[PDB]
Structure formats: structure tokens, C-alpha cells
Design a binder for this molecule. Sequence first.
Ligand code: NA
Ligand code: NA
Length: 189
Amino acid sequence: AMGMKMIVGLGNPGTKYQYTKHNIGFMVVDKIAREHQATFKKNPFEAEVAEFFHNGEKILLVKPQTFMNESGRAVGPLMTYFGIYPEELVVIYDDLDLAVGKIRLRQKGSAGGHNGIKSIISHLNTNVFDRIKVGIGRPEGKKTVVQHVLSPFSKENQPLIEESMCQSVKAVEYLIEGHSFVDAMNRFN
Ligand code: NA
Ligand code: NA
């Protein structure tokens, strides 16, 4: 009766992209799935979905399989399916305006035109929903953005992205446990 939570990790499908910075959201929800012994299953709305319970509450972990720029084609229908509202979402994605090793929690924004957030906004017709922005490092300029996001983390940076993935998992846990998102912002920002 407390409702559900739906944690959506953004990324591109396929082995081509599974280790790229643009897939940090997938990587985080994979870690949460392992933490809870939860398995991703094919879902009919272009997504992989894992489920587990936390003291009676169903938690859904979602990896859209639409490609990043079409993520809302999974998220919108899933919310309909599960009877979930924007307040039950947490979207985890890569932030090119934040350093590797850092996260930031916010409840509103258009993510500087990030194509996954844009798709979600398009489908939900709102930019108001909880998100965990996982820093992937600022690029040199617009010319290098795509290569930046569609390449792996550097060997040198891998320990630091592992740290921010861990903080991201902790932040999700703190929310699942019923703390307000504003309290989570105060704790993790
Ligand atoms: Na399956
Ligand atoms: Na879209």
C-alpha cells in the first residue's frame, strides 16, 4: 500500500554500448540489481525490468532498450502499466556538466538537452521528476561530446566512477527507505 518506486537507468542497448560513459545509468541499476539479487527480464514496452521488494514495497529497476534518445517510449508506457506517477520515478543518467566521481540529485530540469531526459520529458510532458545525475566529466567542446559519451571511462578514472556508482546506489537505498528526496539532496549533494 505504500506504492512502488521505479528506478530508470538510461543508456543504449547492446554490447556496443554497455561500457560507455553514456550507459552509466544502466551500470548503476545493474549494481542495484546485484545488491538485491534481482534479475532483469524482457518487458513488452521496449525495456529490461528487474523487480524486488523492500519491506512490502515493489521496486522496479528499468533499462530502456529503445536507445537513449527514445527512452521515453519505454518509460511512459511502463508508468501506465504499473500505475506509477512521476513522483515514484528516479532517473539515473550521465551528466557531462559534472566531474567523474561526483553525483547530484535534483527534482527538475532539462539536463542541457541530454537526449534521454529530453525523450522522457517529451513522453511525460513534464520536466519534474527525481534524478541522480552521475558525473562523466566535462568535454573539451561540442565537437567531442559524442565521442566522449560513446567511449569507456579511462583506466585512470575507473576507480573514481566506481565510487560515484557506489554513492548512487546508496542514494537509491536512502530513497527506497522512505527518506524525502530533499533529505537525500542534503545528504548526497
Ligand atoms: Na527474460
Ligand atoms: Na522521444
